[PDB]
Write a protein that binds this ligand. Sequence first.
Ligand SMILES: Cc1cc2nc3c(=O)[nH]c(=O)nc-3n(C[C@H](O)[C@H](O)[C@H](O)COP(=O)(O)OP(=O)(O)OC[C@H]3O[C@@H](n4cnc5c(N)ncnc54)[C@H](O)[C@@H]3O)c2cc1C
Lengths: 9, 132, 661
Amino acid sequence: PRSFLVRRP
Amino acid sequence: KPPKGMFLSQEDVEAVSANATAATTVLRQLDMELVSVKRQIQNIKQTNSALKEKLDGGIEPYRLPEVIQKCNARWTTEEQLLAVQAIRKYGRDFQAISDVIGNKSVVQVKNFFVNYRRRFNIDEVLQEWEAE
Amino acid sequence: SGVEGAAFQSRLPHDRMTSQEAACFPDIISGPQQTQKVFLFIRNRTLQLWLDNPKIQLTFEATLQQLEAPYNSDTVLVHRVHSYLERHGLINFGIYKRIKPLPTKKTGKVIIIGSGVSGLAAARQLQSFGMDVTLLEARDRVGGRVATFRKGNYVADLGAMVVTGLGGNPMAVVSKQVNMELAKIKQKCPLYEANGQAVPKEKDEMVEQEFNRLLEATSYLSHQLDFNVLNNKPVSLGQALEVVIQLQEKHVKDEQIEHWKKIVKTQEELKELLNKMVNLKEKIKELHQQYKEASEVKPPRDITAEFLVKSKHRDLTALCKEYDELAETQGKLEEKLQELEANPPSDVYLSSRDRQILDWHFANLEFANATPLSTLSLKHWDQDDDFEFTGSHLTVRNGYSCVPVALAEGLDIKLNTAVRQVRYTASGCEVIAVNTRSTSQTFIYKCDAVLCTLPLGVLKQQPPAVQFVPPLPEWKTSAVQRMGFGNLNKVVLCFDRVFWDPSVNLFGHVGSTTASRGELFLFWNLYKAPILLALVAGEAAGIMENISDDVIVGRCLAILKGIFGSSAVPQPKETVVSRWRADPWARGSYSYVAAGSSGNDYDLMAQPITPGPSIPGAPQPIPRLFFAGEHTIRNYPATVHGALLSGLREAGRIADQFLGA
Ligand SMILES: Cc1cc2nc3c(=O)[nH]c(=O)nc-3n(C[C@H](O)[C@H](O)[C@H](O)COP(=O)(O)OP(=O)(O)OC[C@H]3O[C@@H](n4cnc5c(N)ncnc54)[C@H](O)[C@@H]3O)c2cc1C
């Protein structure tokens, strides 16, 4: 899901 | 409500969604439209290049020196006759008539029309300008 | 606050009663406001006490002692609250020193399929409640999709790697109970294009900003324009991004058109003006000749010949005035046009390099959801956003396996035991397993209840790896079909020396094509030893599983050489390549919300099965077949904390059933 995204704002 | 710099209308979305290749079609139509406008620019600015050429030198060879003529009170017979012929060519345009004579303001020309109306049959002269 | 912080750390609203609480405390929530604030304080305080020291059991007696009046007034209310919290695993979960030793007399028998975190969490709770528990695990180890590689001092997770923040995370409690070395991840992530050149800061920020704007657009496209069905098929996130990009390309072209269309309109103003000026120049040239002829008639003149000179003079000054007025108008239209020619709109929406760098941000999104974006539900892919934890993401330096191994202590676990068939009836269940080493050695476990923690990948397997007798209902099997089970692989590269920026935890690699955006797109540096860890995400994951380790390590070294230079990149001492889709005890990495699915399917997966009666006209049986796992928890899917919480949930649902509420 979204939680795992790297380089998050 | 959409993000800044993103453009998303119901109409535009439907037009890309409505067919399997509608997207690629709509983008081709704009690519052709763009080529069609870019060729028309080259055309009309080559047309305009030719007209700019046919004005080489401007109207400086045909320019007339400035007149320093100062307005005067008394009407010479010369000025009266210039005026009657000016009424014949230029009709009721008082500025043009003043310009022709050279030393009579628009007021004095407007006066002249009333004073001499009788003696220079100005009614007949105006009718003669209208007939043309 | 302190009591309010406990509510938050337990994923509870501090100032309101939940749905679960309303069910266990109807008298309170249906009654007057005062009693509710008493309930809510007793609850919040009991949680605070447990959270302050989660290494020892918080008993009811200990709770009432540390409670002060007027809250320690009602002893049954405090006892009801404490019991509820203990049962639902909000207190006295994980690994704690027990005060009152567990009674030798065990009520009920449960078989748990799988000794992953969901399985282990449930087992501990059930044993803790005095049930007889046995876990059946196909693998030669516990942990399941928590899988840590270990050779000498080298330590690298091939599965779960990251704690996604401690704020409201039950792994916060677990990390105090078990020695996990939690190390903050530094978010700085430099990209490196196909060749080895870092992306220029100005461009990097621009593409990243565009990616986030493109995502935000798909959400607008979904929620506001209601673009969620197309040809009687659910719209994917991939489809929506294609459509949003196409409309951004359309607007670039539309913008160019309107700009060039106002240049032709200005050129056609100029053309119309130049024509007037060319005609007026001829009439001025002609009228000059007429004036010269007239004035070359030397005096003395009659008054008509004098008037002819004067009239032509007046007429020629008038026409010369107009041409000068028109040549002013000409000058300003040339200013207007010289400006427009050097103030054009954008040539293109995204260049070839920009689309390549954007594909990396899409690869990142395909990594996060462990699936190609063409599979993700546009509407619901991010349905768990409101429950995300706060705080820095951390890694487990001593390896994540330390957690399951700790949970497995004091539990009856049959390893190398592959469940083949699950039988459930009104009188009870039998689970039929085999030895994985010799498939002929058959085992039969008789139990009151089965807890199934089989991964969604396994439940999906056709033909089935596990048979249910009787078969699972259509409402369960349809949920299993609809739901997405993703893939994501890891390449572990063990070296003798650190040849990379040791203050950078992760660095990207931009793929040449869209097709290969997922292929070794990201590298992790989190471990004490010299280890780099490369992801294979998106469509690449599935394809790269049919390619040998040597080739994959090959493509890794190549990519690293480009960025660091051939002299700095040695041969790796040890290499491991995960192949999660081919792993028969996983059949993939973790769940995603597939196009055509929603959060409701996660709730369907969590609903227990009740068998029909043995003899017809016999009363409605109790539920026998229960489900836990990452794919069963709507609010925390595809996570370890999700699995953990799903186990605790089922332990409570099973205890409520077989020991009474
Ligand atoms: C590459 C990868 C990276 C991840 N990264 C993260 C992360 O950073 N953070 C995070 O929070 N989560 C992460 N996850 C998710 C996390 O690993 C899982 O959500 C969680 O560990 C699964 O718990 P589970 O108990 O539901 O499943 P599992 O751990 O799969 O447990 C199920 C068990 O059932 C066993 N089993 C299967 N078939 C049979 C059978 N026939 N008989 C008996 N036993 C059987 C399996 O061997 C396994 O032990 C990641 C997953 C992967 C694959």
